[model samples]
Structure formats: structure tokens, C-alpha cells
Target: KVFERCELARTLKRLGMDGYRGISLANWMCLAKWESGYNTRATNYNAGDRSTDYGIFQINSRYWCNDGKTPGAINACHLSCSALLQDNIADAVACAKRVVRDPQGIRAWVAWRNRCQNRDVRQYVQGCGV
Candidate 1:
């Protein structure tokens, strides 16, 4: 099931993501909106290449998942791409954090840069009581 936007605020809170200085839960909420609309099963295969982005965060298989489905994958997150399609997003979230910690500094998410970058997304969670 695709999650409602506000519902994700609490998930981030449960995962202790509400207050990270560099990437807060609020930022996550907005990014999730554009990335996959909170649909855990979301997967996108770029027609131009073998790259596939999976999960709520649209975690890329090129560098994060070992799905084998994506050729030449680096598996930086050391996770199965199929695992990212599940409803439980704990694994996806953990991997996403690791991706953010990489030198890219969240620039890895093109959607965030085009939509959520340099913007205060805290409004996305204000009513969620997080």
C-alpha cells in the first residue's frame, strides 16, 4: 500500500530521523513525495541504461542494491533490490541514509534537487505532530 504523506512523518520519527541537521524527516517527506509518492513497490528502470531505482526513496540499484537485475551494480548498500519493493521500508531508509552520507551529500537524488532543494520542508510535518 502506498502510504499517506503525513503517515511517513511518524515513520521518520520512529526511525529517529526527525532531527538530523543535514537531512531531516521533513526533507525526507518532501523527497518521498516526488521520488515515489510513498509507494514501497515503486521501481523505475531508465530506458537509456540498466539503472533501476526502487522503493519509497527510489533507491538506485546501480549503487545500492544487489538485485543482479541491474547489470554492473556496485551494491554499495549491500541489499537486494527486491527487498526494497517490500512494504517494510526500514532497509530502504537505512540504505538511503548511507547514500546521503556519501560524497554527493543528497545530490544523488535528482528529484530532491529539482523539487525539494534549498527549501524548508518542515511544513510537510507540522500537523503530523512529529
Candidate 2:
């Protein structure tokens, strides 16, 4: 289970982000567990119509598919799995770390949780260099 999550993280890194290399593996695991349970095919019904989101990152097809652009373009799902992955864990973790570094004790994650539906799982692990 952990390995799968790590592979996902690696995929994210390959997509042009090195920050995740410093992200805690446990936090990555928890994020994967929460986002889509490591399921690449996950989709949120609340995402609205023409729902074709895909991959471990859960990137919407609208962004990756170029749906309204060329008529028959390939979406992230049609591309290599690595292409859909992202290193945004750093962005998420960095945001958390900034607040933690302020002696706020993960208050950033709390604030993020309060604003979004997803809970802050990144706070549980450390070393996510901002």
C-alpha cells in the first residue's frame, strides 16, 4: 500500500516537481489514502457535468483533456499515467510548513481544512520543506 503511494509520489515528481522528494512518505500515504484511496479513476460527483476526471491526482478532464479545444484531443487519462501525476504535495506541504514554522502548530492545515471539504492529512508528517 505504501509502495503504491510512493510510486504515485514518484510519478508526481517526474512531472516536473522535485519538492515532493522531501515530503514525508507517511504524509504522502495519508494524502493518497484521503484523495482517492490510491484509486486513479476517482471522481467527485460534485465536480459537475461532463465529469471525466482521472488518475491518482484526480485532475479534471476539462483541464487535461482540452475538451473544448480540438474536438478529439487526449485527456490526462489517455496520456501516460505519469503525465497526470503532479508534485503539488510540496505546495500543499509548504503551505502547511509555513504556518508550522510560525509556531502556529499546524494551524495552517486547520485553516485549510476549515475552508475546504478535505481534511488536512499533511500535518501528521514532517519534513515537507517549504
Candidate 3:
């Protein structure tokens, strides 16, 4: 599912992403926009790490989800990487929350650091009524 901007904003808020671990809703929106363009089925493979990122949040196979192919990968989310690709974002959101529980916080996603961090991320949720 390719969620519309405001729709995703409201959805994420409803799913408890707004202020989870001090990360704002807009920041999460920014990460989702830059990482997957709000597409639930988005997947990116890293040849260097031999791992793949899956779904809207782009949760990785290296240290999050188990893909059964990434060498030494840990399924910290305790679920298959396939779970992240589903249209329902509940699992992806949960996994994303778990990721930020680590010290890196939202910086765990390089794209968020490059695109969303310290930027005008408010635009991501503006006029969304979230």
C-alpha cells in the first residue's frame, strides 16, 4: 500500500508513533517518506552487508528481521522479514519502535540522518490533523 501523506500521518499517530521515545511523529513521517515513499512493499538490498531492508520503515534484515539469508543477522523483532512487506503497517511500526529503543534512536536509518534529521520535518505532518 502506498499511503497518502496525511493518511499516513494520522495512521502513525494512531499507532503510537507520535512521541515514542522522544521521536516526534513528523520525524517518523520524514523517515518513512525518505526511506520508502510511504510504500508498504518497498525493499532495498545492500550488497555490502548482504542484507535487505523491508517495508515502509525499511527495517533491515541485518539486525532486525530474519530473512534466512543475511549472514549472522539477528531477528531482534523476532519475526520474518516478510512481515514488514505486508500492507498492514502494525508489525513494521512495532519493529521501528524496537529499533529506536537502542541508543542510535532514529539515526539508525541513514536516510533519516541525511534527509530528516534537524530539518524542517514538521512539513511531514502539517495539515494532517494528526
| Top model number, TM-score | 3
Stronger candidate by TM-score (1 vs 2): 1
Encode model 3's per-residue lDDT on 53-89: one tens digit a residue.
9999989899999999999999999989999999889
Candidate 1: clashing pairs of residues: none
Name the runs in model 1 displaced over 4 angstroms.
none
Q: Give the whole-model CA lDDT for all candidates, comma-separated.
A: 0.83, 0.41, 0.94
Q: What is the TM-score of each candidate against the true structure?
A: 0.92, 0.37, 0.98
In model 3, the Cα lDDT at residue 114 comes to: 95
Q: List ranges where model 3 is wrong by over 4 Å.
A: none
Q: Can you tell me which runs of candidate 2 are displaced by over 4 Å?
A: 1-3, 6-31, 43-47, 67-130
Error of 2 at 128 (Å): 13
Candidate 3's error at 40, in angstroms?
0.7
For 1-130, candidate 1 gives per-residue lDDT tens digits of 5988778889877886665547778788988888998999898988777899998999888888887766677898888888789887888888888788788767789999998999878788888977
Q: How does candidate 1 score on lDDT?
A: 0.83
Clashes of 2: 0
